[PDB]
């Protein structure tokens, strides 16, 4: 590729590398907040294979879960959205309970994870809190890998950039020397 | 470069050997989106040959188009249907490899000589999705498609 194509490509990944670095620390900040609230007791992606791991056990809350199963099995389960921005408080968690009875009808560590009114309000609050801390830990490492993978591509493109940089300087100069000799 | 660039016009069939393909272990390292031929035409080779020929190159191009997405984000960020297209392309890449007769001396594996009709049949089954359950390493360095299925059963015996 020409020198300009390497420059545009190098500038592209440098931005993505810096942007993925920002999402790592934002995920790490919300991870700290999530773990404190979990000790007593989603929609947004970019968090490893959590949403697929939930679908693994169901075949054998969270609008992203609907997107996977909508084409295959839509009529089975009865809808929630906007989950991931803030951890689910007891006030917001009670809305899940209202759309069940009054109606017509897990985090381990930073780099690994595994998938009547008042009693039911406790079990739903436990599952969502564990899911909140799981996705923040996964998004932390996911964006951390994205930045580190971007860093490697920048390093190799920087070497390819400098090789092509020198070649252009040498080639253009040989044209001028070729021109002067022919006079 | 001027020297190789000029020769292209003087050739009927071209065979572009890539280093990136060779370094991955895929031999012979013939680039499937660079090598070309003038007899590659439905009138000459037949409509079934030409249709299967473009199908291999199509899914290989789609697989190559998603490399930037797999590098930064990952395989999990890809769509469910896109995972199927990436899976088959890698099996197609490995099935394009082949043990050579002259390579026996250093490689060790016996050389293969696949007929034309068996080649077209083999790749067409992979594109249709008749061997999606089998692993990739079964396709690496085999003759026809029949020996790829038998090689998967051998790997199945690691317990």
């Amino acid at each position: 590729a020409t020198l300009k194509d390497i420059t545009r490509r190098l500038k592209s990944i440098k931005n993505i590398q810096k942007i993925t670095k920002s999402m790592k620390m934002v995920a790490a900040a919300k991870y700290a907040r999530a773990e404190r609230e979990l000790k007593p007791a989603s929609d947004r992606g970019l968090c490893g294979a959590i949403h697929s791991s939930v679908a693994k056990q169901m075949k054998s809350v969270g609008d992203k879960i609907r997107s996977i199963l909508h084409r295959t099995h839509s009529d089975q389960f009865l809808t929630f959205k906007e989950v991931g921005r803030r951890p689910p408080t007891f006030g917001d968690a009670s809305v899940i309970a209202l759309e069940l009875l009054n109606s017509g009808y897990r985090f381990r560590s930073v780099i690994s994870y595994k998938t009547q009114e008042y009693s039911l309000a406790n079990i739903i609050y436990y599952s969502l809190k564990e899911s909140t801390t799981s996705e923040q830990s996964a998004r932390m490492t996911a964006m951390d890998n994205a930045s580190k993978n971007a860093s490697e591509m920048i390093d190799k493109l920087t070497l390819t950039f400098n090789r092509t940089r020198q070649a252009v300087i040498t080639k253009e100069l040989i044209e001028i020397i070729s021109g002067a000799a022919a006079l | 470069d001027p020297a190789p660039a000029t020769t292209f016009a003087h050739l009927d069939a071209t065979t572009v050997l890539s280093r990136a393909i060779a370094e991955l272990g895929i031999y012979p390292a013939v680039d499937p989106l660079d090598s070309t031929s003038r007899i590659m035409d439905p009138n000459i080779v037949g409509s079934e040959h030409y249709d299967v020929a473009r199908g291999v190159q199509k899914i290989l191009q789609d697989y190559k188009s998603l490399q930037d997405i797999i590098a930064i984000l990952g395989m999990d960020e890809l769509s469910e249907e896109d995972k199927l297209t990436v899976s088959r392309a890698r099996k197609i890449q490995r099935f394009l490899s082949q043990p050579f007769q002259v390579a026996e001396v250093f490689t060790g594996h016996l050389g293969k000589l696949v007929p034309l009709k068996e080649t077209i049949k083999g790749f067409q089954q992979i594109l249709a999705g008749e061997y999606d359950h089998l692993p990739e390493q079964a396709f690496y360095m085999v003759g026809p498609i029949e020996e790829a299925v038998a090689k998967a059963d051998k790997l199945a015996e690691e317990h």
Partner: peptide, 28 residues
Amino acid sequence: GKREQAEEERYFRARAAEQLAALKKHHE
């Protein structure tokens, strides 16, 4: 990127192990 190939090969090595597990249990 080298880590592109690292993540991809890791993913398909895991899925290759799953496919060999299903293949062996079906073989029995």
